[PDB]
């Protein structure tokens, strides 16, 4: 193209260009105030409109890359706020944009963004629309500067619909609140979810990763062929690369590329394509991403002939071992979408080590005759954990299951902070009542989404300052070996109960002043506390001291004195679980 800036605009339209502009400008120059962002957007954008205008226009037939970083280079102050990376500014292209990549920081150091009052946020939103959304648009990509721009885009037209729906409503906080918090979990998700595949890809290498995407596209497009797979996960590794390396033009022209060759060709991958492939450029990827599991071929027959019976299984599987272990992933992930990725590389890789053994012994065919038999027991695990987990659940509903789960957990890693054991058991408790509405032939793909994120910030806080050889070996093992590694967690039978502390067990009548989720917080913190101190107590006996605990709240809130209610009952309860426990 003679003017890539003019090809740009004309592609993504005036509003999407100004609001990528946005986001990149935002991800690089994190520290730069708003009002400067919106100056340089501007900028940008009314160069764009003279390229639109004549395509021979004055530096029109310059490269993103050069008009870019040499805007990046014009902020006078980029020495001052960031040193090394105004140094890159004295670099020719392509070093210079390196340059700039190097010195992008993944945890900036920004105060937390507080959620204003609604009333605030709804009086913003309708005096100035524009300034409010774009503000926040900025707040978000300058903390999360590795986040691909167009999927923060995505988000940004789901906040806007929550503020138009919300701001007009009866009872907004009620509408507009649920809605915030479930865009923030997700956003938070999707930013965990990106940085995560990008670590495992560096961790566990390519071989790996492409493992994984053969079991995910088979699963998602089970009529295409497996040369047409094979070359699909060839291209999405490419991808991922890319990606993760964080060039955003690189990152989007290979999106692109890949969901441009998948709309060519959609008889030859699956019939759910035609609705995201008429979707525009930029919603494109992103689409297909998402894209519902296409149906399984009607009549397909058990893998037992190509993978167990022929004669010919260690000729092909020696010829080409990848290529033939991608083979059977292909074929068995393509008929269980009801199974997670990481099921299905389990299988692989079971059925790996058998053909290794058993294709250098006497009779190979007598060896891995059974094969077939190992695969019962790895299925069944996880779709045992999922129905008691789900029955558990179902007994006990989200707040009374997460307590069941915060006393398990407790007992099983007591040397876990009680923020973290509280968090991860509310997080996990969050998965049971997701992911158990689910009918049985989705709740495993489901359970192994949400679970991966949870069990990964779990990893990282953890991680950061340590207190469990368990736990770290849990989060070091094999990204298959993971999940099953924490389902093997035991009670801790050599942990040395924590000492009894008065003031733990001191409750004010502030609790009852205090919502919903922090009171619920409150009390699941000292139920951790309560299993420390007693972790031999039985069912029975804590039921009883969280029964005698409902009735001591419920009673001294609702007092002529609520304050020496708490002190004087309060003394009452404690002395009395004290002789109830042990
Ligand atoms: N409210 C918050 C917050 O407390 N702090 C954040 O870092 C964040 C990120 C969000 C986010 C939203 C959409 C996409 C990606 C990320 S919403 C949000
Ligand atoms: C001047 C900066 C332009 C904005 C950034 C590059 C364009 C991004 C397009 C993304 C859409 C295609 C790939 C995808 O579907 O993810
Ligand atoms: C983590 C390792 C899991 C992979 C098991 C073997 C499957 C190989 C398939 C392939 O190479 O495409
Ligand atoms: C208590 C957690 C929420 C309820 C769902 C239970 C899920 C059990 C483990 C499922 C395993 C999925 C991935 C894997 O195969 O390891
Ligand atoms: C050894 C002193 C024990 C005093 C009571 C400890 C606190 C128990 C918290 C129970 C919270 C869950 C029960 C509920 O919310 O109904
Ligand atoms: C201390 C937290 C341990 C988390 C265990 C997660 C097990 C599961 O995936 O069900």
Redesign the pocket.
Known sequence: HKSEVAHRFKDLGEENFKALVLIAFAQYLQQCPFEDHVKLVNEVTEFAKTCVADESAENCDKSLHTLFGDKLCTVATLRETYGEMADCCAKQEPERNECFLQHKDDNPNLPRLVRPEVDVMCTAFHDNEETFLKKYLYEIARRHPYFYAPELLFFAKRYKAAFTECCQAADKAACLLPKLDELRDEGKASSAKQRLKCASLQKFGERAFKAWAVARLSQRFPKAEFAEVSKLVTDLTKVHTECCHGDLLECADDRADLAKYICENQDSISSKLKECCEKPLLEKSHCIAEVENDEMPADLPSLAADFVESKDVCKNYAEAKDVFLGMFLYEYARRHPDYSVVLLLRLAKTYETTLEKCCAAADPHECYAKVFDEFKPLVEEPQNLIKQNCELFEQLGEYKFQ?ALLVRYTKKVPQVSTPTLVEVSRNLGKVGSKCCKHPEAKRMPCAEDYLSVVLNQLCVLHEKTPVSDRVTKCCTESLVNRRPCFSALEVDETYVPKE?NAET?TFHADICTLSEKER?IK??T??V??VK??PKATKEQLKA??D???AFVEKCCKADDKETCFAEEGKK??AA??AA?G
Do not use: G, R, T, Y
């Open positions: 307590n009894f067990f619920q009390k699941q000292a139920l506390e309560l101190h007693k001291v969280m005698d605990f409902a309860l404690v679980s004290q426990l």
